[PDB]
Amino acid sequence: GHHHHHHSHMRRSIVVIHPDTGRELSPEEAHRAGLIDWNMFVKLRSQECDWEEISVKGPNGESSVIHDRKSGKKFSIEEALQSGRLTPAQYDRYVNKDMSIQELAVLVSG
């Protein structure tokens, strides 16, 4: 038997189409191309999110960490169960695939 790494990754991105080159631009690039003003840029960003949950399944059992790829913050699940921000009632839903990566993010993140 060998270690398994379970990745549950979800992402929401937005692309801005150039009127002429029809090229896909990132809110960032659109802003530099003057296709959008600073506040629409912020607005657009606030709508993006990138979360990834990685369950290391080994010999001891399952270790699990969820990462906010947008902010760079990480959250131990065991550390969330211990500290109580996550109830073994909700963890069970995630484990049983009845809770999204985002619903779980919110629980442990804020």
Question: Would you give the distance in Å from CA 73 to the centre of its chain?
Answer: 10
What is the residue whose two structure tokens read 């969820």?
66
DSSP state at residue 1: -
Distance, in Å, from the CA atom of 28 to the CA atom of 47, rounded to the nearest integer, reads 13
State in Å, rounded, how far the first CA of the chain is from the last one: 37
Distance, in Å, from the CA atom of 98 to the CA atom of 92, rounded to the nearest integer, reads 8
Q: Are 16 and 36 in contact (CB under 8 A)?
A: yes
What is the residue whose two structure tokens read 């990745």?
7
Distance, in Å, from the CA atom of 13 to the CA atom of 30, rounded to the nearest integer, reads 14
Q: Name, in order, each residue with C-beta under 8 angstroms of 56's C-beta and a sequence gap of 6 or more.
A: 3, 4, 5, 6, 62, 63, 64
Distance, in Å, from the CA atom of 46 to the CA atom of 69, rounded to the nearest integer, reads 14
Tell me how far CA of residue 65 lies from CA of 29, 42, 47, 50, in angstroms: 32, 28, 23, 14
Distance, in Å, from the CA atom of 6 to the CA atom of 51, rounded to the nearest integer, reads 14
Structure-solving method: X-ray
**CATH architecture designation of domain 1-110:** 2-Layer Sandwich (3.30)
Tell me the DSSP string of 54-91: EEEE-SS-EEEEEEETTTTEEEESHHHHHTTSS-HHHH
Helices H / strands E in the chain, number of each: 5, 6
Classify each residue of 76-85 as buried b or exposed e, where b means 16 or more C-beta atoms within 10 Å of its C-beta.
Answer: ebeebbeeee
Stated in angstroms to one decimal place, the resolution of this structure is: 2.6
